[PDB]
Amino acid sequence: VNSFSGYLKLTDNVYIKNADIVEEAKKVKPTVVVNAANVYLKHGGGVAGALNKATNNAMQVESDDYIATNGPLKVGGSCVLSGHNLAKHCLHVVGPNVNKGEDIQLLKSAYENFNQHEVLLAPLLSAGIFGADPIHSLRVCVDTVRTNVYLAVFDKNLYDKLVSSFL
Ligand SMILES: C=C(Br)CCC(=O)Nc1ncnc2[nH]c(C)c(C)c12
Ligand SMILES: [Cl-]
């Protein structure tokens, strides 16, 4: 039993809800919140901009030190950093950004990072300003993640479309 509430069960291990991941994280304080990161950990907009703003820019300060030490992530890769006031940990995961021309096949590699964590609160990777089809992202999630994933979908219209079309 965990503290996640109001989710629709899609499969044995994948759940979905119309929710703002920022507000959901603040309420649940999950062990792991997933950020929709870029390789530079520049948290300017989309989910990343919202998560960072909620940390009062502490996420960005920590991230800049991480990049100064380690260099950029790989597309499809991840790193574990602090969850600040939102979660114990933040798993920064880089899905391909279609608006940059990145290979959509890397979306599966991106979701594989979730399997290193028993339970996660997450957005759909590569959705939103990353330009991928969210229906495809949900399919890859379900077919790749084996650990327990709680998906927060901000847009109510998109959430209903994702549910109604789920096979
Ligand atoms: C937004 C659209 Br159109 C479709 C993608 C989507 O639902 N992305 C998200 N999913 C969950 N929490 C979220 N918080 C914020 C700020 C975003 C962007 C977000
Ligand atoms: Cl985004």
Side-chain angles (χ1 to χ4, degrees):
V1 177
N2 61 52
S3 167
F4 288 102
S5 178
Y7 286 75
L8 178 67
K9 186 170 176 56
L10 294 175
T11 68
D12 182 62
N13 64 302
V14 180
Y15 295 78
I16 194 168
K17 182 183 178 180
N18 170 227
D20 182 349
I21 192 171
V22 169
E23 286 308 303
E24 186 74 4
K26 277 193 294 186
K27 148 177 129 54
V28 177
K29 287 296 233 81
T31 305
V32 181
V33 66
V34 174
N35 181 33
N38 59 52
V39 299
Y40 307 110
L41 302 180
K42 287 173 60 95
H43 307 303
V47 170
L51 290 171
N52 177 57
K53 179 177 174 182
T55 76
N56 184 43
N57 211 50
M59 178 180 285
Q60 191 63 67
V61 171
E62 179 195 30
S63 293
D64 287 351
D65 171 83
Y66 173 93
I67 296 286
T69 297
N70 300 108
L73 295 182
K74 299 170 179 179
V75 179
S78 70
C79 67
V80 181
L81 291 172
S82 179
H84 301 276
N85 53 317
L86 305 177
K88 188 175 193 298
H89 303 107
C90 179
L91 181 69
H92 295 272
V93 180
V94 183
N97 189 324
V98 174
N99 305 313
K100 299 181 179 177
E102 292 165 353
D103 172 19
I104 194 61
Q105 300 298 135
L106 290 168
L107 187 55
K108 188 174 184 74
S109 303
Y111 273 117
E112 287 171 343
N113 295 286
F114 289 25
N115 289 321
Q116 300 294 317
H117 302 277
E118 287 193 356
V119 183
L120 315 85
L121 170 64
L124 283 168
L125 297 180
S126 298
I129 69 177
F130 281 63
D133 181 354
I135 297 179
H136 177 64
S137 182
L138 176 58
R139 188 74 257 166
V140 178
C141 181
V142 163
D143 292 342
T144 305
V145 182
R146 298 176 301 282
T147 56
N148 292 143
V149 57
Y150 289 83
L151 295 166
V153 178
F154 179 57
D155 188 74
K156 171 60 170 168
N157 289 321
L158 174 61
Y159 169 86
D160 288 347
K161 182 193 189 121
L162 287 167
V163 167
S164 288
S165 64
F166 184 71
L167 231 195

